[PDB]
Symmetry: C3
Subunit: 137 residues, 3 copies
């Protein structure tokens, strides 16, 4: 039976003079031990091929938002995929979700990140609006 | 072999909405018998972990729309995932969830008389047991 | 171990009087031989049930936009799924990734196309923004 992990937000973080916002994740479903949430990143322990999906629900008013999913490993940062979505100007209509997913080879030791490249991004903590998960294939 | 069900619309529903618009679903691809379409709902007969995806293609032009995918089991109703958006506009989302025998799955658009497309390649619903 | 294919864009074909734009793909992740990328289309050699996903990032503004994923097989073309957005009013608010995916029975001898139904559509060739993939289930 395949290893899987579905994660939802506990809170959002944004370092001082960075222009980055990330999510502190918590597991709500887990089978197997190939994956482990460790705060705002997810560590891979079992080398192999994984379906990886990300949704973020944005409430920002700025031109465009979108999250970047990348894998740190082997001295590199590699971008796996990115979701881009344009935002309305009207602020009471800023409720837009961005879903992307793909299949990628991950090695044990790799760190997976989900970054939104603005500071203090207005991201929903709602577990059904913003989430992240994994299925070993 | 993984159990699967891929479903496409046959119709929408009734005037007075209770603030919701729904879809009658027709299976066009199946493997295994642990999932069953019962009109506007899908029943889960085999407890397990499932990929569940949903797309809805809107013709409408209002506030926000999007769809709410939920499960109701022994006692309690629970939102699994949602797609939100602000003349043709598709809204896709998906996730992996633990579904229980006896579960009713619903896909509800939370507005009255939403104009939804019945194109089987614009609005659809699916399950893969993992 | 399930067969898989993650593909990224090498180029865009678009015939002078055809109203359509296609993507030439190349695999960056491959397991098994049941699928074969070929010019602007993917051939299916191993009959089965497949998860298929597609994202396109559009450079275009002022165009109602999205992609069509289809198969040709036993005599006739068939639309599997599409993604669609209205991407008009404001040109500074145009960028949107369009993602869709589904599970489909593919037959040996099937060609899989991703098409944008407009002449000379401007797409990002970015492998993080535009991609196609397959997982046999």
């Amino acid at each position: 039976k395949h290893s899987v992990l579905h994660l939802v937000p506990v809170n959002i973080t944004s370092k001082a003079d960075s222009d980055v916002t990330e999510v502190m994740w918590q597991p709500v479903l887990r089978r197997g031990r190939g994956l482990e949430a460790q705060g705002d990143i997810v560590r891979v322990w079992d080398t192999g091929i994984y379906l990886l999906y990300s949704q973020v629900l944005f409430h920002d008013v700025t031109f465009t938002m979108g999250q970047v999913v990348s894998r740190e490993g082997q001295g590199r940062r590699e971008t796996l995929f990115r979701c881009i979505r344009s935002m309305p100007s009207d602020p009471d209509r800023a409720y837009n979700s961005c879903y992307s997913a793909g299949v990628f080879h991950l090695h044990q030791g790799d760190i997976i990140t989900v970054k939104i490249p603005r500071a203090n991004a207005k991201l929903s903590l709602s577990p059904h609006g913003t989430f992240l998960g994994f299925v070993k294939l």
